[PDB]
Amino acid sequence: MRTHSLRYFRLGVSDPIHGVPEFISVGYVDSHPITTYDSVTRQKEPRAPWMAENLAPDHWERYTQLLRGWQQMFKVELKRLQRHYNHSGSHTYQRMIGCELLEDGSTTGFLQYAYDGQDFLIFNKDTLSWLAVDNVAHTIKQAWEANQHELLYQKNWLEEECIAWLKRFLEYGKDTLQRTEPPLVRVNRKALFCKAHGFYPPEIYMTWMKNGEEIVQEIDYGDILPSGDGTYQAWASIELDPQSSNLYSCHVEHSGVHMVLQV
Amino acid sequence: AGVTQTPKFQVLKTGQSMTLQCAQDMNHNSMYWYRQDPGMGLRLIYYSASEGTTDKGEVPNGYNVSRLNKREFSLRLESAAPSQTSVYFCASSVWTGEGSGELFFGEGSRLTVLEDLKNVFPPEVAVFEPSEAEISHTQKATLVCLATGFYPDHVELSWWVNGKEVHSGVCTDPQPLKEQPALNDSRYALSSRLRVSATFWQNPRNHFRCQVQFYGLSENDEWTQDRAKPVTQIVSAEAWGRA
Amino acid sequence: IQRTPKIQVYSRHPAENGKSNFLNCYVSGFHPSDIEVDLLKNGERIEKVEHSDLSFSKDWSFYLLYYTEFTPTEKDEYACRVNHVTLSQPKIVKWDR
Amino acid sequence: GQNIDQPTEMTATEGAIVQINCTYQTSGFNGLFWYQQHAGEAPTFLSYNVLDGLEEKGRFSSFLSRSKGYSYLLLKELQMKDSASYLCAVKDSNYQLIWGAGTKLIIKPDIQNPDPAVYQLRDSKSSDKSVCLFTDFDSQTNVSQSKDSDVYITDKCVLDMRSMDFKSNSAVAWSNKSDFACANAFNNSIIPEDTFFPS
Ligand SMILES: O=C(O)Cc1ccccc1Nc1c(Cl)cccc1Cl
Ligand code: NA
Ligand code: NA
């Protein structure tokens, strides 16, 4: 297979304005949302049809309870952080946990915490330690690292349990997560715009080459964007030189297939 | 401190209401109710992940719970049944979900559910003084205490020497003895020994006392039998040292 | 540190006058998550506009996709107006072709 | 699954080493717990394993093999106070605990100077029961039921006179039936050949 990733996000906001929730939790396999929970619904609900189809009510009832607890725990350590920083008003607190299953068979695990959208605490499962970006984080770190049973737990979960979940979901959503839709590539003029659309997965490689050598460097890349139908689109541009004749060609790579469009 | 749970003992008729209380002062978020039965592992009845939510466990039928606050998690028997006869344990942890966090248990609560209280009996307690043969041969003196005829197994045996409770030199049967093992209704017996130096027993002003605390009926339990109402009571028997 | 939103306006398929299509407004790379996004048909709001749920990125930023169904014409010109904590006045990004 | 298996009961000698096994078949694995429960008391946390290897805490050690799906609790230099039930519990993929049925550890005391004897105890003036006491016998001696059931015999128990560092085994027999003597109290069980019977 390709590189597949499972990643779960949690957001905590201190003074949510108006109808904004104070706690949100969403799960992703690759680029697809699979499960969601907010402080208003207080339920864990499917966000993909193949998730609702394959997981018994037991699952949703069990994880609903757990997320209610996490809503509490996050509201409490957002308070302790905000006191240590001496920060008034609004601040955010985020958490990302997850796996990656690489094509070659290797894996990666990661668990991170964030404050105001900045790195705050990063876990290293290979050294069983927490990296702190400041001294507020350093204070939290010293307590966490004193409980090595907890650290050993996280290492085991990231390396075995998360990966196991991912394989489980990859099969649930096989018809979606493991399909290939090749890109449609064309070349426009204004600078040559190499434009691709209608492809999945969204991982795509585009570049311009002059006379057989890569432009190193002033290619202008466009972001990979969702089309709204499950496919994606992107582009790359280079300005054409009016002094010299040059063979410009756009190179696209996608799911193991290389493509060349010459001009 | 720690995890507090009440009552420690309880006798119930079919089918009577009952509420078990549990409190924890460790500022734990997750609390639990387990029942323990012979031959099988603990079974979760209900649990509470945090201060504002509860959910069913493995064996929720015939029960319900209320997480009153962050400290208190009460278990409730709707209508008592013989199958609900068990030891119940309250427990709490910092967090039920992700983590290496362990459980902190309460002392436990033994509930016995009967069709009627007609078979409830207090223990008969007798103390038996040491053999003079033992004292000559081993220079030690063993008092034996028997508590017989009681039901259910809701007893606590203890030895008292000169007004103060002792534990050294004491061995009490870890399980009680069924006097009529063939029967489901069978009353129990429980032996215990206190073994002291011969020079201790031979002092005439030393006082020995075997006390058995029994947990049976309370004031509000109905009693129609022609014998004494087997209420919660202490029953003792005593000895003094010989010459 | 607060991050301003990135606003991109594009069509689902290569647009042609007369052919039905979808107008997308992708808003990404902003923080905090508080945001409001509506599409413009030559100045006035479109009301029949769908959107995905809020989403999360590895760099702790959030993103969103707003979209309508439409048939592009020579006459019409579209835009997407976005308001965020990092913006003092509503930022308007017009659709190009 | 899901399933946790644990031996019902184990017997070992004082001063020796015992290894209590726990094999689990679960839906995922988030950690294995050991608990100690004394009879009549509440279970208390002993150890926690989640990664392969052996972790030591005093006389106790806990080992885990995730691949083989088993764990053991090792108790070195056994003492009488180690007599309890030991509970194995595995956390599954959904962080729910599965509990084993527990293992009861019985510790046989090292009796240095055996002196097996059955003593007739003094009658009480408040009971019709006559009482015999089998005592000071070796730990390999087992006590059996009475095949008479107006006679009541209790399983052996260990008392510790901690001011003399002295441990002894003892079983108690009693009855009110008129044909009951200590001479015949423990016939249905195997008592030592050198047992002392005072007249
Ligand atoms: O974080 C969430 O959105 C749900 C949640 C709650 C408690 C524990 C784990 C999870 N997420 C989760 C789930 Cl639901 C399945 C597999 C892997 C993970 Cl990290
Ligand atoms: Na295609
Ligand atoms: Na119930």
Q: How far apart are CA C6 and CA A191, in angstroms?
A: 23
Q: Which amino acid is at D144?
A: S
Longest dimension (CA), chain D: 68
List, comma-separated, the residues after which chain A is broken, a break being a C to N distance over 2.5 A; otherwise answer none: 190
Alpha carbon of C68 to those of A117, A228, C17: distances in Å? Answer: 30, 10, 16
What one-character DSSP code corresponds to residue C89?
S
Of A150, A179, A208, which residue is a domain's last?
A179
Domain count, chain C: 1
A146 with A185, same domain?
no
Q: How far apart are CA C73 and CA B26, in angstroms?
A: 68
Are the C-beta atoms of residues B149 and B214 closer than 8 Å to each other? no
What domain range is C31 assigned to? 1-97
Domain count, chain A: 2
Are the C-beta atoms of residues B150 and B178 closer than 8 Å to each other? no
A51 with A93, same domain?
yes
Q: Which amino acid is at A6?
A: L
Query: Quick one: CATH architecture of D1-109?
Result: Sandwich (2.60)
Of D7, D168, D199, D154, whose CA–CA distance to D87 is shortest? D7
Solving technique for this entry?
X-ray
What domain range is A35 assigned to? 1-179
Are the C-beta atoms of residues A229 and A215 closer than 8 Å to each other? no
Bridge partners, residue B102, by sequence: none
Are the C-beta atoms of residues A145 and A131 closer than 8 Å to each other? no
A32 with A104, same domain?
yes
Is A75 annotated as a binding-site member?
A: no
**Cβ atoms within 10 A of the Cβ of A3, count?**
14
Is A217 annotated as a binding-site member?
A: no
A170 with A239, same domain?
no
The domain that holds C89 is classified in CATH as 2.60.40.10
Bridge partners, residue C13, by sequence: none
The domain that holds A235 is classified in CATH as 2.60.40.10
A35 with A157, same domain?
yes
Q: For residue A152, list chain B residues with Cβ-Cβ distance below 8 A.
A: 100
Cβ under 8 Å to B: A residues 52-81: 61-62, 65-66, 68-70, 72-73
- C-alpha D37 – ligand 3 centre gap (Å): 28
The domain that holds A103 is classified in CATH as 3.30.500.10
Of A109, A144, A179, which residue is a domain's last?
A179
Q: For residue B148, list chain D residues with Cβ-Cβ distance below 8 A.
A: 129, 152
Q: Does A150 touch chain B (CB under 8 A)?
A: yes
CATH 2.60.40.10 location in chain D? 1-109
> Who's near A235: CB < 8 A, 6+ residues apart?
A193, A194, A195, A196, A206, A221, A222
A166 with A204, same domain?
no
Are the C-beta atoms of residues D37 and D102 closer than 8 Å to each other? yes
Residue-wise over B50-80: b if at least 16 C-beta within 10 A, else e?
A: bbebbbebebeeebebebeebbebbbebeeb
Of A159, A179, A199, which residue is a domain's last?
A179
Q: Domains of chain B, with CATH numbers?
A: 1-115 (2.60.40.10), 116-243 (2.60.40.10)
Residue-wise over A30-60: b if at least 16 C-beta within 10 A, else e?
A: bbbbbbbbbbeebebebebebbeeebeeeeb
The resolution, in angstroms to one decimal, equals 2.7
Element (H, E) at A250: strand A248-254
